[PDB]
Design a protein around this ligand. Structure first.
Ligand SMILES: [Br-]
Ligand SMILES: [Br-]
Ligand SMILES: [Br-]
Ligand SMILES: [Br-]
Ligand SMILES: [Br-]
Ligand SMILES: [Br-]
Ligand SMILES: [Br-]
Ligand SMILES: [Br-]
Length: 287
């Protein structure tokens, strides 16, 4: 039996990665390019919509629209759960990890209070796994999962310490069906990591929610994606595996019917899946 809906939201502060970013990695990499930062690249690049790592608005943008909230979206493509980014060359200019987004948020209050009504939305960890796999991380995946969880709990604790009261924390996505993971023959590694994060994180956050009296909602993205991928026709989806916009090994022309595609590129869902996700994320909240 469902429980009462949480109180309405008028302001969201979003922290996370390429699954939330609504223009920060674009703004930041253009600033880094203008300053000649070593190794800087224009992200996300030309085959993406208005600086989103997709062909449309991300889930949290749709969530804000659904809830009737203003959105401050601090998320940065590649952001890890700690201080830094998949893109290691960013660290010289800015710490764009979850921890760094939290630091920058709290630094820019100007000594005004945190908005205790504002929803602090956290959606991060995929970049931890991608960096570990692409650059041959030494740690066991179980340890990496442990670090991701501890990093996210530390971020919720630091935001709450500053006066945040309301949180929505997103689980690991299903990294196991990400085209790049399938192509890298890394499906079992993705399963192990995501199951370890998604088992531990809600237990760790439950404890923090109770100690601090937080309002903290957990969005199970894995259950969400399983339901889409089991019954795609229901949602008008046709292609669950092939990217609409291939980039690897090189850019090829976009598919004709992107709203019938799950994946935009080899890592990121299309605007259609982002819409369904943001609509599903809104389910715990009164409008
Ligand atoms: Br990412
Ligand atoms: Br990290
Ligand atoms: Br890091
Ligand atoms: Br409230
Ligand atoms: Br680690
Ligand atoms: Br790939
Ligand atoms: Br799994
Ligand atoms: Br645990």
């Amino acid at each position: 039996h469902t429980s009462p809906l949480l109180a309405p939201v008028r302001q969201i502060h979003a922290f996370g990665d390429s699954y939330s970013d609504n223009g920060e990695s674009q703004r930041l990499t253009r600033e880094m390019l203008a300053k000649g930062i070593a190794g800087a690249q224009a992200l996300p690049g030309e085959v993406y919509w208005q600086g989103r790592w997709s062909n449309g608005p991300t889930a949290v943008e749709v969530l804000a629209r659904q809830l009737g909230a203003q959105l401050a979206d601090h998320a940065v493509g590649g952001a890890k759960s700690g201080a830094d980014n998949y893109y290691g060359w960013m660290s010289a200019y800015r710490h764009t990890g979850l921890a760094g987004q939290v630091d920058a948020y709290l630094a820019t209050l100007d000594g005004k209070p945190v908005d205790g009504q504002a929803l602090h939305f956290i959606f991060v960890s995929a970049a931890d796994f991608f960096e570990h796999e692409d650059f041959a991380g030494e740690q066991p995946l179980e340890q990496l999962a442990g670090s991701s969880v501890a990093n996210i709990r530390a971020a919720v604790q630091r935001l709450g310490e500053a006066g945040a009261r309301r949180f929505l924390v997103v689980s690991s996505t299903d990294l196991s069906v990400v085209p790049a993971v399938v192509a890298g023959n890394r499906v079992e590694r993705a399963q192990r990591y995501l199951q370890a994060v998604n088992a531990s994180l809600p237990i760790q956050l439950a404890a923090l929610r109770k100690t601090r009296g937080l309002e903290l909602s957990w969005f199970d993205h894995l259950t969400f994606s399983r339901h889409l991928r089991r019954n795609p026709a229901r949602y008008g989806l046709v292609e669950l595996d092939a990217p609409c916009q291939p980039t690897q090994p090189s850019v090829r022309p976009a598919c004709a019917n992107p709203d019938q595609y799950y994946f935009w590129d080899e890592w990121h869902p299309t605007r259609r899946v982002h819409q369904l996700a943001g609509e599903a994320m809104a389910a715990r909240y009164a409008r």
